[PDB]
Write a protein that binds this ligand. Structure first.
Ligand SMILES: CC(C)(O)[C@H]1CCCN1c1ncnc2[nH]ccc12
Ligand SMILES: [Cl-]
Length: 165
């Protein structure tokens, strides 16, 4: 199971790690992808997870969108975890660079509550443009199930821990 995490709260844990390497090591029931509404896994967490599946995640995702249309900002879908996990929960946080409402970040994290245990990144961080410190606060104040956060930036990880209030 999960190793080397700092406990932030009763249910939130955090580690300086690449979510792809964590997933390959642990093979959790659920890995969260930081998706966009089109499930176009081009870069960041999504591009890295998809690359590790040899593009099978993208092929599955394109079939999903062709059938169902895009997700909502704040929404999610459950797809296969391929070689990385049983399932992948694709969750769309708001992209501040697109003018999307940061309040939708709480809605995005609510999707985690449908799953008992998840390996996840901080939503809306990275190329989605939001402050990771704010994202962690929303996570802790929204998710009630057990979440293991992989932060792939050592300086950021240290700042998140040292400023956690
Ligand atoms: C740095 C931060 C917040 O953790 C997010 C935003 C940018 C990329 N990132 C990642 N997180 C975890 N595992 C990852 N693997 C590849 C990328 C990646
Ligand atoms: Cl990202």
């Amino acid at each position: 199971s999960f190793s080397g995490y700092l406990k932030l709260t009763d249910n939130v844990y955090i580690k300086n790690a690449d979510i792809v390497e964590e997933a390959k090591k642990v093979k959790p029931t659920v890995v969260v992808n930081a998706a966009n509404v089109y499930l176009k896994h081009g870069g960041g967490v999504a591009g890295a997870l998809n690359k590790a599946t040899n593009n099978a995640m993208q092929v599955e995702s394109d079939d999903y969108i062709a059938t169902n249309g895009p997700l909502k900002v704040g929404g999610s879908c459950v797809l296969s975890g391929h070689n990385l996990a049983k399932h992948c929960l694709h969750v769309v946080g708001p992209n501040v660079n697109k003018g999307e409402d940061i309040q939708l970040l709480k809605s995005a994290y609510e999707n985690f509550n449908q799953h008992e245990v998840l390996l996840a990144p901080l939503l809306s961080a990275g190329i989605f443009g939001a402050d990771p410190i704010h994202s962690l606060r929303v996570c802790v104040d929204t998710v009630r199930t057990n979440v293991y956060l992989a932060v792939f930036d050592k300086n950021l990880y240290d700042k998140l821990v040292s400023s956690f209030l």
